[PDB]
Amino acid sequence: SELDQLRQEAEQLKNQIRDARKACADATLSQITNNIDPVGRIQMRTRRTLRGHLAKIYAMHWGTDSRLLLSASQDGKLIIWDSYTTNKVHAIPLRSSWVMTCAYAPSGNYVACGGLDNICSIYNLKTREGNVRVSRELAGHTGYLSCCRFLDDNQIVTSSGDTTCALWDIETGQQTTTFTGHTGDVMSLSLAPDTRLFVSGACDASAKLWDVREGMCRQTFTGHESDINAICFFPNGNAFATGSDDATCRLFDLRADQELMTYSHDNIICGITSVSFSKSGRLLLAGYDDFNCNVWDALKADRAGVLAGHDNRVSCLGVTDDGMAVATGSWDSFLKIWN
Amino acid sequence: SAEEKHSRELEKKLKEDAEKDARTVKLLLLGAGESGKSTIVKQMKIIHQDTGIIETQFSFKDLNFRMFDVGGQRSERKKWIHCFEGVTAIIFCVALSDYDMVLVEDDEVNRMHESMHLFNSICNNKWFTDTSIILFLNKKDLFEEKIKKSPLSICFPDYAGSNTYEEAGNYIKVQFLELNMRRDVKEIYSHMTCATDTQNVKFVFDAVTDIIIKENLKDCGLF
C-alpha cells in the first residue's frame, strides 16, 4: 500500500550512488597502461595424471602443505592423497552419498564436506588408523550447501541454498552468527587473507562483502547481466575477480565500487565454472564449458595460454599458494596436475 | 615401500566397492504438490515382504533398486538437477483428482495446468533426453466420482464429450503424451492405479527391464 513509495524513494538514491561511482569514472586499467609489455606466450604440459575415481568429481582444494590434494567423487568417496608419489593416503566413505564442496585446514589437520543433504560433516584425521571417525555433524539448514571454507581450526563458514550465509563454531554445534539479506541463492565464497571478510556471490549478480566481528553488510557490486558461479580475490587483499555463466569474467576493487577490468572475449560463448588467481597475479586462471582451461593474462586482456586437458567439462580448479603447480578437475574422474 | 603397499590395498578396496556399486538401477522420483508420494512410497518398500533428499531402497525379483526423492529442498531448479543425469527411469507422478483442486497457495490455480507446466520442463530440458519416463496417475476412486456432473470442460475446453470413466481417462493420458517432444528415442509407459491396489511393482519391473534389453543393444550396436 505504501512500500511502492519506498521503492520510488530507493530508485533515485540508487541512481545517486550510480553517479557517485561515476564521479571518478575513469576507464579500465588497459586504457591507462600503455607503457607495459605483454606477458608473452606461456605453455604448460602435464607432469602427473591422477587416477582412481569412477564418477564425476566436483571440487578440490590445495593444502597449506603444498603437497596434499583432496577431492569429492559423486558416489560418496572423499579421497585425500599426495602429489609427489601419486599414491592415495586416505579413502573416506560418506554417511550421505552426494558432494558439492570440499575444504581443507590451515592447520593441516582435518577436513569438512557436505552436499545436497543439508549437513556440514567435519571429519577428524589425526589419531585414527585407516577409515576415520566422523568428528562432528552440523545441521541448521533447509537448503543445499554450496561451499565451506576453514578460517581457523575452530570456526567454519558456510553458504547454503536458503539464501543465507552462516558463521559456525564446531565444538558447540550451533550458529554463532548469520549473514542474511540476500535475494537470490548464493553460490560460492572465499575467505579474505586476514580472516576478516569474505565476498559472497549469488543469483542476481549481487556480489556483496561482509565483515565478521560486526556481522553486517558492507557494499554492493552489480555488474553482470546474468548469474555468477565462482569468486576469489587478489592475495594482498585489494581486489576480487568474478566469473559468470556468460563468459564475463570481471574484476572489481574493494574500495572503488567499480568494474575495474573486464576480460571478455568475442569467440567464447559458454559459461565458466571456477576462477582462481595465481601467486603473482600476472595471469588469471579459469575454466569454461568448452572443455578448456584457457588462461587469461591479468594485465592486457589477451588469451595468453590455451590448454585442453580432457574431453568433458572442467568442474573446479585452484592454485597452490606457493604457486609451483596448478590442479584441475574434470567431469570424468581424471585429476590433471598442470605445471 | 609401506606407503605404496598401503595405497595398493586401498585401491583394491576402492575398485571392489565400485564393482559392488555398479549393479543397481538408480531411479529418480519427483512430482509437485500432494501427488500421491505417500501412497507410492508406502506401496513400494515393505508391502511385498508382508529435510534433505530421502533415499528409500527396495528390492524385488533378483534386481536391487534404489530411488531418491526431490520433495524437501525446494530452490532454484536449474542448478542441482544436472547432478542426476544418467539415472535410468524418471518416475513421474500426477494426481487424477486435480480437477477439483481450486488452489494450493495462490488465489486461482488449477492443479492440472501446474503439473503440465512441470512436465514440459523436463522432457525438453537438455539434461534429460535419453532417459525414458515411467508416468503414473493415481487416486482413481476419487476420479470415479465423476458420475456426479462436475464437467470435464472446467479444466479444459469441451473436448472429451463424455462422462463415464472409460472415455475421460483416455483423454488425460493423450494430453500428457502429446506434450512429449519425441526428440530422440525414448517412450513413455503410462499406467493407472489407486490406493488399495497391489503388485504395481511388477509393472515398474516390467518397464525397467525394457530400458535394459532396449538399451544394451545400443552399446553392442545391434539395434
Partner: protein
Amino acid sequence: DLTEKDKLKMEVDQLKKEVTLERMLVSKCCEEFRDYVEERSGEDPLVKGIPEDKNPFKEL
C-alpha cells in the same frame, strides 16, 4: 510477515547505509595494482620456467 513487506525495508536500509562510502582514484589504484604485480612477477615460479631442480614433478 514472511518476506514480502520486509525484504524491501531491509534493502532500502542497506541502500541508505551504502551512500556514505567515499571512493575515487581509479587511475591511482590501477597504478598501485600495476606496481604490485610487477614488483613480484619476475620471481614468479609460473611465468618463466622450471630448471628441473626443485619442482617436485619430475617425470619418474
